[PDB]
Design a protein around this nucleic acid. Structure first.
Ligand code: NA
Ligand code: NA
Length: 327
DNA sequence: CCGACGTCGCATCAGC
DNA sequence: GCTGATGCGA
DNA sequence: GTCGG
């Protein structure tokens, strides 16, 4: 569906969504506007009225009324006003920095810190994450072409195998589903020696090696099971250097690995459909395990999972490729 | 009418 | 110094 | 803000 169809409407709703999350700090209103924008962005007709839109699930009374105003005037008085508000628009903008949420953004703008320039002049008021988010503000808002993702995958799989040939690494996200571009890289890691009923260095050693070959450049956070950081492809000789990228690496116990792979492969809509099914067939699927219920509703023990297909089999769907997992 | 709207790892703060 | 809460991103 | 028990 072309943007020109209902783009003014969905942009309006998305803009309203951000102010709810970042300014009003009403996270549930933020997702309400998002969900409404989503169902409208999929609607294969140019909307003529709020009442027409209201038929869609996620569009209620208040949004239908806002659509009425927008269709008649081409604008929203509330949105126009808050756009022009210096304090509100500053708070909403600062949250685009990774590490700066609604709370930090408010505190900054409270004490007169409103711009990136302002942030750069006040380094010691930033924590480690926020400084990294500031440093790579532009780079982080860029997307990653699949070709670069493939190049990034080459390095990750190579270095991981080099540390220990028994490691298993899988790049998930939209990339695994075959997307033409990605927002970041999400790597799922496991090792035969690591199970739920079971070392404290399995993740570090992988991170360390990727730092040694200078793939990983910065660290946002790092524990025993989850790494969040920054990486960059090596500069192609005399050519323009690649943008710094966000990369996450999480260590998952072997017996929970493929539930994790399935979950973090998505899509979100697919995951909801899949576990809905799922429910009807008497199983419960989360990020970690698939478990049976249970006449009362009482969940039993997690079932043995050795592959993605295993999960599909338990609930009698035929296995579907990552590519066909949009919904 | 009114509660749900995933859940959790890590960094850091608030309180003792 | 330890313990739990909070902010943040996913 | 929207949905639903
Ligand atoms: Na509706
Ligand atoms: Na942010």
């Amino acid at each position: 569906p072309q943007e020109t169809l209902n783009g003014g409407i969905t942009d309006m709703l998305t803009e309203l969504a951000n102010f709810e999350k970042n300014v009003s700090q009403a996270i549930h209103k933020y997702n309400a506007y998002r969900k409404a924008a989503s169902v409208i962005a999929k609607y294969p007709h140019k909307i003529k009225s709020g009442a027409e839109a209201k038929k869609l699930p996620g569009v209620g009374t208040k949004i239908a009324e806002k659509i009425d105003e927008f269709l008649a005037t081409g604008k929203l008085r509330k949105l126009e006003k808050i756009r022009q508000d210096d304090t509100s628009s500053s708070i909403n903008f600062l949250t685009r920095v990774s590490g700066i949420g609604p709370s930090a953004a408010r505190k900054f703008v409270d004490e007169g810190i409103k711009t990136l320039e302002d942030l750069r002049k006040n380094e010691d008021k930033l924590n480690h994450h926020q400084r990294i988010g500031l440093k790579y503000f532009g780079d982080f808002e860029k997307r990653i072409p699949r070709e670069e993702m493939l190049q990034m995958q080459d390095i990750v799989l190579n270095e991981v195998k080099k540390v220990d040939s028994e490691y298993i690494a899988t790049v998930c996200g939209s990339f695994r589903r075959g997307a033409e571009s990605s927002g970041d890289m999400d790597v799922l890691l496991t090792h035969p020696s690591f199970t739920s009923e079971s070392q404290p260095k399995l993740l570090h050693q992988v991170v360390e090696q990727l730092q040694k070959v200078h793939f990983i450049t910065d660290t946002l956070s790092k524990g025993e099971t989850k790494f969040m950081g920054v990486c960059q492809l090596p500069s192609k000789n005399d050519e323009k250097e690649y943008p710094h990228r966000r990369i996450d690496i999480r260590l998952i116990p072997k017996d929970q690995y493929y539930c994790g792979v399935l979950y973090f492969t998505g899509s979100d809509i697919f995951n909801k459909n899949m576990r809905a099914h799922a429910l009807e067939k008497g199983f419960t699927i989360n990020e970690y395990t698939i478990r049976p219920l249970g006449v009362t509703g009482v969940a039993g023990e997690p079932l043995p999972v050795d592959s993605e297909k295993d999960i599909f089999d338990y609930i009698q769907w035929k296995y579907r490729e990552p590519k066909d997992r949009s919904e």
